[PDB]
Design a protein around this ligand. Structure first.
Ligand SMILES: CCCCC/C=C/C/C=C/C/C=C/C/C=C/CCCC(=O)OC[C@H](COP(=O)(O)O[C@H]1[C@H](O)[C@H](O)[C@H](OP(=O)(O)O)[C@@H](OP(=O)(O)O)[C@@H]1O)OC(=O)CCCCCCCCCCCCCCCCC
Ligand SMILES: OC(Cn1cncn1)(Cn1cncn1)c1ccc(F)cc1F
Length: 1335
């Protein structure tokens, strides 16, 4: 373990120094070989000497002195708009004091502790000391100095010497401790003149020395880890944070609750590390702690006590107790001094001494007045004034290395991070390769005739898209590494711009690999121009396109906070760019209001360049001459003409240049200009991204058990976890259950309540009044978990009412349930915040309120037998733990039987329990019985069986733990299990259990048939309640429904008004088909938005509501499925109204007088599409754990469905292999139904550019020459007054609809098929969730 720089640590440092000085080999106190060499002096000298000393003033230590310091500071979805308007009006155009006058001085090498109750201003004080005043202001009368410097000097020039870090250890999970510390050592090492010593080896030696100092040498080559990623222990992560902070050159270090959620054995090591840093490296550590042990308190040098923002004492930690006792306060026996000082601000505690009850401060003002009047304050003020006088009498860039060095080190660290977790690049490259192969399969081997003119247009449109979004997932790397970048900026290590540049540079190999793997396959599987130069130009254009898109995505993400948050507004922009690339709406078809968008579209130029490269200067063999068929068997080719935009009469080949000029209006003079435009766009977006990164940042029945033995299978070997345990509980008694780490107290608690998912019971038996456990036991107990798992939107009253309704017997009327909920609220003292939203931990109920709500949720269910509590007091400050203990005592007084597991309690807390069950290592009970007054009886047990007498001022818990040798460094005289087995107290317990079993059995039973039911409420009631709760939670979510509405409305309006009043020419029909195709894009964003709110509900249900048997899994999954339907239906209605009418599709129904039926069918189709989106998202999420994986799988399946939906290529051109994917596609039928409903049964009028000139034979007219063909195939013609006929190949939209395999007579059937698919999804969900999650 860590014992704070013992002799062997000095030996290790001496060996390291010997190795370092021998490596560079190729006074007495600094020679590792010479005797009388002290590691402390070597470590101190390493930082200053053995490196060049810049002429700039750089302090090696800091201390802060200040006087007169004062700091002060100033919903559903319907009302969200009103709240936003009010907030904006407030933005357009009293004082609540936090910290009152304070005076203090902290010198280097002294560890300081800020004591006080929560909300007393300790965190604010430590923020002020660390020049972190953001969010409030300090008074102008306050005199603050840092060894003669100024707060603004520290803020701007000397940033990084003073650091603040409170509760979150932000590290890279997959980076080893050695690498993490080497990075800081390298970045903090000055360069200047490196002659005489290598910088790399010096940094390595410094990192190794600091690892040795903080006892982290054994953690080298081990991943730092995280709460999710496994790595070093939680107590080692804190020491890693300390080592990194001290290695970067921080002198003043402020921590708030950095030890929160740590056991005493590890909090003590944290304080020991802080003390070691203070004494060896002359740092100034300040810590704000709420649960401090006596051993930890013995390490503090100075203490500052805060009472509602008033500093009531500052001085040596060994004199606070005497000062406050002289004030007239009595310290209760067996109370740690830290707890005494903290409780001296609690009216419930803080009992005055006898005779001092009349003259003692009672309010914060009186305490402050006493402190000011005391001689200690006078001495402190004199010392601070002298320090100020001494300081008065006697670097633009806080960073150390140059920008190039910062970029280089960032690139190296990013490469190391990729090496540690190489899953993402490999997955991205393989996905790109596979999806490019699949996409090229449909476009395989495009022919050389004009029949490919469309497909060659589509392929090049989908190549660019594939290159555009290939780097979309890299944005994730921005969000993961953001907190670490902010921390290292606050440490004055490197700038955010340097990290951005390093991130851009590091993924260039990945970008190149993806580009090669996709383009090389695609350009050749899809038959494009085979010229090597053409391929290389295409590759260059794709490379520049992907650079532009990557920079744009990075710019968008630099000002975001979440993937869905960035995708909601960015989806509209990306859809607009995709639409105006130049293929969906060719330039001739673009409207006047939107022709400007194409000018500022970075992808339109790429598409134009690629199309020019492929088509210009190319001749395509004609595939279909318009006059042909049975009536035209032998005619001259002079009369015929090709069916293409640029076709020339009498020509057997069509030139690519004419087709490009006519259809798209692309020209070869723009082939290279577009490259320059794209390069300029890339540079502009890169500059914007860097600028944003730099700037935009910042109970009659009795339950007992006998001989309970419990074993589990570990490494294919049986292990005994519980060894013949026995005991009981009785109404009105609290039975603490304690033991060592390996005592298995938690295992005993879980096994008693039947919450263990493994193991078997061998010898024991659990009884209720002597009767075995029936099926009604699980519903006759309450269980309060350590963690508080509640929905963030439900109110306290609603949270209690849900449980009361779903867990109480049905015969009880709703009024009785509400009355009991009110009674429980009154009992637990929640009337003040009965209607308050639970909210998140940071904003909402505090820890005590959340724990009270957790207890109440179980109480309202009316447990009849027992109330298990899993560590109720753990993870709470002394006062909140005291309050919870008093609440438990009150509950016991009311007739409840309580059995609680207790971990590391204080003497006062332990004195409140009625009975104790103490477990040794291996589940062996050492003591079971009443602990008497002040734990006296328990003390009277061990002392009477050969144990050292308990100290008069020691905590009984710690003493009894160390008597049995459980505590580290403690020696047990003998195993106390055998002592307990034959002690005349085990005999009493056995006799009592036997008497209870023999006697209580005679009592008449209370056999209630409803008790023997798995769930209290019927299935339909559970389903209805769960669905309504989910609907309300979605409605009250802050910005979810509005996000969906905004995304859908914007996308639908843009799509509708891009094709506003679309004309029915030959190109207009294709444009409208691709409009329908693009109507489905918001699928991915909707799924991503919706999944997290399913994650939250699933977590809440499975963690707590599943074992409690509140409702069945079916009522959960069906409720989740039903919750989303109404919102999707409303969204689909809005989208249909925003898209159908702007396109003017109703005009296609006027000729046949079928406006209403077709409109109704289209509305149903759109709403069904949205419902299908929701069902598919839920299906893909059912069997997966993480939401990101479910979203990715849904996107992949949607892409596969869209590829083979019949738009890009019909079944005739699709390879026979993929035909099944064309039939099993839910989207083929949807697209066919939509197209047939919106386009069928109307006329077609060709545009001027689409008419093909036909020269009739000499001595013939247009009609007499073209009528037989018109009878064969549709179309019409016009006379151009020149002798030629302008022919249009299509006269009715039915021809195009048949070309796309869409029929107007099969719309309804198609619709039905789509509905079937929706049904399937739902069914699959209800099955998959059972297979993957239900146990
Ligand atoms: C960290 C960032 C990393 C980014 C990656 C870095 C990338 C840097 C690359 C720098 C390389 C720059 C090369 C520029 C030199 C162009 C010289 C041709 C200029 C020209 O102009 O060549 C026109 C004809 C086609 O022209 P065309 O068929 O469309 O029409 C004309 C005819 O070519 C004809 O020649 C007559 O014109 P000229 O006599 O030439 O003036 C007239 O004929 P007609 O009008 O009567 O038909 C017409 O103008 O190019 C052709 O064939 C094919 C010729 C190769 C096309 C580009 C070269 C390939 C790129 C290099 C490598 C690709 C990426 C590199 C690796 C990627 C990742 C590692
Ligand atoms: O990524 C695609 C293009 N694509 C890639 N392989 C096959 N088609 C598919 N896609 C992704 N989500 C939905 N469809 C795309 C990207 C953006 C876009 F606007 C359309 C579009 F088809």
């Amino acid at each position: 373990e860590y014992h704070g720089f013992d002799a062997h640590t000095s030996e290790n440092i001496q060996n390291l120094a010997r190795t370092f000085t021998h490596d560079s080999f190729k006074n007495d106190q600094l020679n590792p070989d010479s005797e009388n060499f002290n590691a402390k002096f070597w470590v101190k000298n390493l930082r200053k000497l053995f490196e060049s000393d810049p002429e700039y003033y750089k302090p090696s230590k800091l201390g802060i002195g200040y006087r007169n310091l004062r700091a002060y500071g100033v919903p559903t979805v319907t009302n969200a708009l009103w709240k936003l308007a009010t907030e904006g009006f407030r933005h357009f155009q009293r004082y609540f004091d936090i910290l009152k006058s304070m005076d203090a001085i902290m010198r280097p090498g002294e560890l300081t502790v800020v004591l006080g109750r929560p909300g007393a201003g300790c965190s604010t004080l430590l923020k002020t000391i660390a020049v972190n005043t953001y969010g409030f202001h300090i008074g102008k009368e306050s005199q603050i100095t840092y060894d003669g410097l100024s707060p603004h000097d520290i803020e701007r020039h000397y940033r990084g010497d003073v650091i603040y870090s409170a509760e979150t250890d932000v590290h890279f999970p997959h980076l080893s401790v050695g690498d993490t510390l080497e990075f800081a050592a390298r970045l903090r090492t000055p360069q200047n003149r490196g002659e005489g010593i290598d910088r790399e080896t010096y940094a390595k030696h410094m990192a190794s020395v600091y690892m040795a100092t903080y006892g982290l040498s054994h953690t080298r080559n081990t991943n730092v880890g995280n709460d999710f990623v496994r790595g070093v222990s939680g107590g080692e992560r804190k020491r890693v944070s300390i080592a990194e902070a001290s290695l970067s050159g921080a002198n003043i270090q402020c921590w708030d609750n950095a030890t929160r959620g740590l056991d005493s054995a590890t909090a003590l090591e944290f304080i020991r590390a802080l003390k070691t840093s203070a004494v060896i490296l002359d740092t100034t550590p300040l810590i704000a702690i709420y649960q401090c042990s006596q051993d930890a308190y013995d390490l503090f040098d100075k203490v500052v006590v805060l009472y509602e923002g008033y500093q009531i004492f500052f001085g040596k930690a060994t004199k606070a107790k005497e000062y406050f006792e002289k004030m007239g306060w009595k310290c209760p026996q067996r109370q740690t001094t830290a707890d005494f000082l903290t409780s001296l601000t609690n009216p419930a505690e803080r009992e005055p001494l006898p005779g001092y009850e009349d003259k003692v401060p009672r309010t914060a003002q009186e305490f402050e007045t006493y402190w000011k009047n005391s001689p200690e304050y006078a001495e402190l003020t004199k010392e601070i004034d002298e320090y100020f006088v001494e300081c008065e009498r006697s670097p633009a860039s806080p960073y150390t290395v140059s920008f190039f060095m910062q970029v280089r080190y960032g690139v190296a660290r990013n490469f190391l991070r990729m090496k540690g977790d190489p899953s993402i690049p490999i997955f991205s490259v393989f996905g790109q390769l596979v999806m490019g192969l699949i996409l090229s399969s449909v476009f395989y081997n495009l022919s050389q005739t004009t029949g490919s003119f469309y497909y060659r247009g589509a392929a090049m449109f989908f190549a660019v898209l594939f290159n555009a979004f290939s780097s979309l997932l890299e944005i994730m790397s921005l969000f993961e590494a953001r907190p670490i970048v902010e921390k290292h900026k606050k440490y004055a290590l490197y700038r955010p711009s340097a990290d951005a540049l390093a991130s851009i540079i590091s993924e260039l190999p990945v970008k190149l690999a993806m580009s090669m793997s996709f383009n090389f396959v695609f350009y050749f599987m899809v038959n494009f121009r085979r010229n090597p130069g053409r391929f290389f130009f295409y590759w260059l254009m794709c490379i520049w396109c992907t650079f532009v898109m990557s920079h744009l995505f990075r710019s968008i993400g630099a000002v975001s906070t979440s993937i869905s948050g960035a995708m909601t507004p960015a989806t509209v922009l990306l859809l607009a760019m995709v639409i105006y690339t130049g293929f969906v709406i060719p330039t001739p078809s673009m409207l006047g209001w939107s022709r400007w968008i194409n000018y500022i579209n970075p992808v339109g130029y790429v598409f134009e360049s690629l199309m020019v490269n492929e088509f210009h200067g190319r001749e395509f063999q004609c595939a279909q001459y318009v006059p042909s068929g049975p009536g035209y068997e032998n005619i001259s080719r002079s009369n015929q003409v090709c069916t293409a935009v640029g076709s020339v009469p009498g020509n057997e080949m069509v030139s690519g240049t004419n087709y490009l000029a006519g259809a798209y209006q692309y020209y070869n003079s723009h082939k290279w200009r577009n490259l320059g435009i794209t390069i300029g766009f890339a540079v502009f977006f890169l500059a914007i991204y860097i600028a944003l990164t730099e700037f935009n940042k910042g109970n009659r029945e009795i339950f007992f058990w006998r001989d309970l033995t419990y074993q589990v299978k570990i490494k294919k070997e049986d292990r005994v976890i519980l060894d013949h345990v026995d005991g009981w509980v009785k109404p009105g008694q609290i039975t603490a259950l304690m033991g060592a780490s390996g005592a298995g107290k938690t295992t005993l608690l879980n096994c008693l309540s039947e919450r263990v998912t493994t193991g078997i019971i061998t010898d024991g038996e659990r009884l209720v009044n002597g009767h075995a456990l029936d099926s009604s036991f699980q519903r006759s107990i309450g269980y309060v978990q350590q963690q508080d798992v509640h929905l963030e939107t439900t109110t306290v009253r609603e949270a209690l009412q849900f449980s009361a309704y779903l867990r109480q017997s049905n015969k009880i009327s709703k009024k009785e349930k509400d009355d009991y909920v009110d009674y429980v609220i009154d009992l637990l003292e929640m009337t003040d915040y009965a209607d308050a939203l639970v909210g998140v931990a940071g904003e909402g109920l505090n820890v005590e309120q959340r724990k009270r709500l957790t207890i109440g949720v179980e109480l309202v269910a009316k447990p009849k037998l027992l109330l298990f509590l899993d560590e109720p007091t753990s993870g709470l400050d002394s006062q909140t733990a005291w309050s919870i203990c008093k609440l438990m005592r009150k509950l016991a007084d009311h007739g409840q039987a309580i059995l609680c597991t207790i971990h590391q309690p204080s003497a006062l807390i332990m004195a409140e329990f009625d009975r104790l069950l103490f477990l040794q290592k291996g589940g062996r009970t050492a003591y079971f019985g009443e602990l008497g007054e002040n734990c006296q009886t328990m003390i009277n047990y061990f002392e009477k069986y050969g144990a050292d007498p308990c100290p008069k001022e020691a905590n009984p818990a710690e003493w009894m733990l160390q008597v049995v040798g459980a505590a580290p460094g403690s020696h047990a005289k003998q195993d106390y299990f055998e002592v307990w087995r034959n002690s005349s107290e085990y005999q009493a317990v056995r006799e009592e259990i036997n008497r209870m079993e023999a006697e209580l059995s005679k009592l008449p039973r209370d056999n209630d048939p409803e008790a023997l039911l798995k769930y209290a409420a019927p299935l339909w009631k559970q389903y209805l309640l769960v669905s309504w709760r989910t609907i309300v939670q979605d409605w009250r979510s802050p910005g979810y429904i509005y996000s969906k509405i905004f995304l859908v409305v914007s996308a639908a309006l843009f799509n509708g008004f891009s094709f506003f009043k679309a004309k029915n020419n030959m190109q207009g029909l294709q444009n409208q088909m691709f409009s329908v195709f693009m109507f489905f894009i918001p699928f991915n964003t909707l799924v991503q938005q919706m999944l997290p709110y399913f994650v939250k509900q699933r977590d809440v249900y499975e963690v707590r509501e599943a074992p409690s048997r509140t409702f069945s899994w079916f009522a959960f999954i069906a409720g989740q499925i039903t919750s989303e339907i109404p919102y999707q239906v409303a969204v689909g209605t809005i989208a249909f109204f925003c898209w159908y009418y702007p396109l003017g599709l109703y005009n296609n129904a006027t000729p046949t007088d079928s406006v209403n039926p077709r409109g109704v069918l289209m509305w149903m189709l759109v709403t069904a599409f949205y419902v299908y989106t929701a069902t598919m998202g839920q299906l893909c999420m059912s069997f997966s754990e993480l939401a990101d994986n479910a979203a990715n799988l849904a996107t992949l399946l949607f892409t596969m469905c869209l590829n083979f939906c019949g738009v890009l290529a019909g079944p005739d051109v699709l390879p026979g292999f993929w035909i099944f994917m064309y039939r099993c596609n839910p989207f083929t039928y949807l697209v066919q139904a939509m197209l047939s409903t919106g386009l069928a049964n109307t006329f077609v009028k060709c545009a001027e550019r689409e008419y093909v000139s036909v020269k009739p034979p000499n001595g013939e007219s247009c009609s007499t020459y073209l009528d037989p063909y018109i009878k064969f195939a549709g179309g019409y013609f016009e006379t151009r007054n020149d002798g030629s006929c302008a022919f249009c190949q299509m006269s009715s939209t039915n021809t195009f609809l048949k070309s796309v395999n869409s029929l107007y007579s099969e719309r309804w059937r198609n619709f039905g098929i789509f509905i079937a698919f929706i049904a399937i999804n739902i069914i699959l969900t209800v099955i998959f969730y059972w297979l993957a999650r239900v146990p």
